[PDB]
Write a protein that binds this DNA or RNA. Structure first.
Lengths: 21, 317, 291
RNA sequence: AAAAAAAAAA
RNA sequence: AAAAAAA
C-alpha cells in the first residue's frame, strides 16, 4: 500500500495521482 | 540574547528535564516540546479535570485521569529524556490554573501573573510549532492512513484543538476545517500548509533558516514542505563534500502570487476547471515552476510531479 | 408613482441619512442599504439581544451588543453617509420589535402594525437585492479566498442567514447549501447566480435594466453575472464615444475544441445572437485588460 | 411574458 | 508586533 498524491504547493497545481499524469 | 519565547521555552525544558535534554537532537526537542505541551494543557495524569461542558464520557475520562497518579520523578520520556524531581514544582508554579483567562488576570493587576500567563501562551506557541514540524518530518517517511484524497491532505497536519488555538496559521485538523468552513472574519488565518518553520534545533536558538546552514535532507524537507508535497523541492538541498548525511541549504521556495483560474457554468455554458489547461485539449500540466530564492538570485525550477515520500525512498535504493 | 417597495426604502434612507444620502452613487446606496439591513435585523449596538437559544459565547456577544452604546447622530457610515437625529425615532417606530411574527400582527388586526411589518419585509427584500448586487460588483476585481474549487464557487454569493431568508432565490452561502443539501419543501427556491439585478441607482427608482441605458462595464457585469462567470458576457456592453468609463448596454444574456465552441445567447436590439464563449473568467479578463 | 405580488418564513 | 479567545 502507498499513495501518489501531490498536493498543490508554492504556486504549483495539485495532482490527484502521479502515475495518471 | 534571545527573544522571550525562546528563552522561556529553554528555561521550561531545562527545569523539567535536567541535563538529559539534548539541545542538538531534533527528536529530543520534539519529545520535550510534546511533553511540555501536554503539561501546559493539563493532559497529563493527576492534573485538573476539564468538565465545564464535558460529556459524561469526557467527564469519566477526565476524572479517571485526575484519579490516576501523576508521572513519577525519573520517568523515561520518549527515548533520551528523563524527568527530574523538580518538575512538579515548575508544573505547580508556571502552569496557569485550569480555566485561567488573560482578561481576568489583567483585571487582577498582578504583574507576576501577567508575566506567567504570557509565558504560558508563548510556550504553547513554541511547542505547537515544534509539533507541526515533527508532524511533517514524520510524514516524510511514514504516510498517515487518515489521508487518502487531496481533500484529506488539504488539512494536514491533524492536531488537537489546543494546537489550533495556539498557532492557527500552521495547524490543520478538524478545528481548521471548522474555522475555514464557517464565516471568515478579520482574525481568521488561512492554513499555511507549507509555511517555513525552522527545525527545532534552530527554532529554540532563534537562528532563522537560511542559505548555507548544514541540514539533513529530511529535516530541511520537513521545514519547507511535508511528505506529500512535490519532489522538486529536493532541489533546495545539495550534499556537501564526502556525501555523508548532512548537506547544505541552497534555496528557499516562495509561496506567493496565487490566483484563481476557474470559469463557472452560466447562461448555458459548461463549467471549466481551468482556463489554461483547457487550451485545445492539451492536459500537459508539467511546465509549472517553483520560484527558488538562491544567493545569486531568484530562479525557477520545473516541477517533477512526484511525491517527496516516493522520491526519498526511491533514490535511496 | 413608484411601488410601495421602493418608496419605503427611499423614505427610510431619507429619514435615517438626511441630505447626505446620494441617489446616484452605487457605493453610497449599497452602504446605506447595508446599514438599514443591519438596523432592521436588530444587529446594531444598543438593540435587542438574540437570546432564544444562543450559546454562551453567542450569549456574551448579544449581551455586549445590547449593552454597547447605540450609534449617535453625526456618525459616519461608509464614506459619504452621515446619521441624523431622526434615525433613533425611525429605529424605534418602524423596526418591528425583536421576534415579531407576521402571523401574530395579522391576528391582532392592528392595521398600523400590519402596514409596518409589510414595509419592513419590503425593505428587507430590497436591501438584500442591493447586497447581492454589491457582492457581485466586489467579486469582479477581488475574489474570495474560499472560492478555490468549482464546488465552492457553486454557492456564491456567501451572505448572512437573514439575507438568504429574505431572498432565497438570489443568495447563496452556507444556508443555501443546507437547503439544497437537505430536505426540500414545495416552497423551495433554486439559487440563480446570474439573476439580473438592476444597479442600485436603477433599482431604487424602479428603472428596469434594458438596452440603450448608460451604465459602466463593472456595473453591467455585476448586474448580469459575477467574477467567475465566463468573459463573453462583456460583449453585452459597448463603450461610448471617448470611453470615459461610461458606455451603453447593447444586450442582455438569455437563459440567466467543442467545449470552447459553446455559445451564449445575447438579446440585441435586432434579435437574439450567438456569441462564442471566451473561456476566461471575467475577473481574469478584467485583470488582463487593466493594463 | 421565467418576472412581480399576496399567503408561509451554523 | 500587539490586543481578543471548544467535537
Amino acid at each position: 500500500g502507498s499513495c501518489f498524491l501531490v498536493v498543490a504547493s508554492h504556486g504549483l497545481s495539485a495532482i490527484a495521482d502521479s502515475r495518471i499524469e | 540574547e534571545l527573544p522571550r519565547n525562546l528563552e522561556v521555552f529553554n528555561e521550561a525544558c531545562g527545569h523539567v528535564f535536567g541535563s538529559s535534554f539534548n539541545r542538538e537532537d531534533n527528536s529530543v526537542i520534539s519529545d520535550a516540546a510534546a511533553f511540555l505541551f501536554k503539561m501546559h494543557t493539563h493532559s497529563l495524569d493527576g492534573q485538573e479535570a476539564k468538565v465545564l461542558r464535558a460529556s459524561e464520557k469526557k467527564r469519566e475520562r477526565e476524572n479517571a485521569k485526575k484519579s490516576r497518579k501523576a508521572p513519577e520523578a525519573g520517568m523515561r520520556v520518549g527515548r533520551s529524556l528523563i524527568l527530574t524531581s523538580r518538575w512538579t514544582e515548575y508544573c505547580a508554579t508556571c502552569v496557569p490554573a485550569l480555566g485561567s483567562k488573560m482578561k481576568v488576570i489583567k483585571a487582577s493587576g498582578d504583574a507576576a501573573m501577567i508575566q506567567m500567563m504570557k509565558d504560558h501562551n508563548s510556550l504553547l506557541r513554541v511547542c505547537v510549532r515544534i509539533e507541526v514540524w515533527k508532524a511533517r518530518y514524520v510524514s516524510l517517511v511514514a504516510l498517515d492512513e487518515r489521508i487518502q484524497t487531496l481533500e484529506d491532505a488539504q488539512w494536514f497536519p491533524y492536531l488537537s484543538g489546543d494546537s489550533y488555538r495556539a498557532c492557527p496559521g500552521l495547524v490543520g485538523g478538524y478545528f481548521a476545517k471548522k474555522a475555514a468552513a464557517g464565516e471568515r472574519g478579520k482574525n481568521y488565518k488561512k492554513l499555511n500548509q507549507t509555511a517555513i518553520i525552522p527545525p527545532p534545533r534552530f527554532l529554540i536558538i532563534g537562528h532563522r533558516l537560511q542559505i548555507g546552514d548544514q541540514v539533513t535532507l529530511r529535516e530541511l524537507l520537513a521545514s519547507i514542505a511535508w511528505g506529500l508535497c512535490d519532489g522538486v523541492l529536493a532541489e533546495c538541498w545539495s550534499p556537501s563534500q564526502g556525501d555523508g548525511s548532512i548537506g547544505v541549504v541552497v534555496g528557499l521556495p516562495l509561496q506567493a502570487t496565487g490566483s484563481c483560474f476557474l470559469v463557472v457554468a452560466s447562461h448555458g455554458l459548461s463549467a471549466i476547471a481551468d482556463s489554461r489547461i483547457e487550451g485545445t485539449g492539451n492536459t500537459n500540466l508539467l511546465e509549472e515552476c517553483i520560484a527558488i530564492q538562491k544567493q545569486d538570485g531568484v530562479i525557477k525550477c520545473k516541477r517533477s510531479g512526484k511525491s517527496l515520500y516516493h522520491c526519498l525512498k526511491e533514490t535511496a535504493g
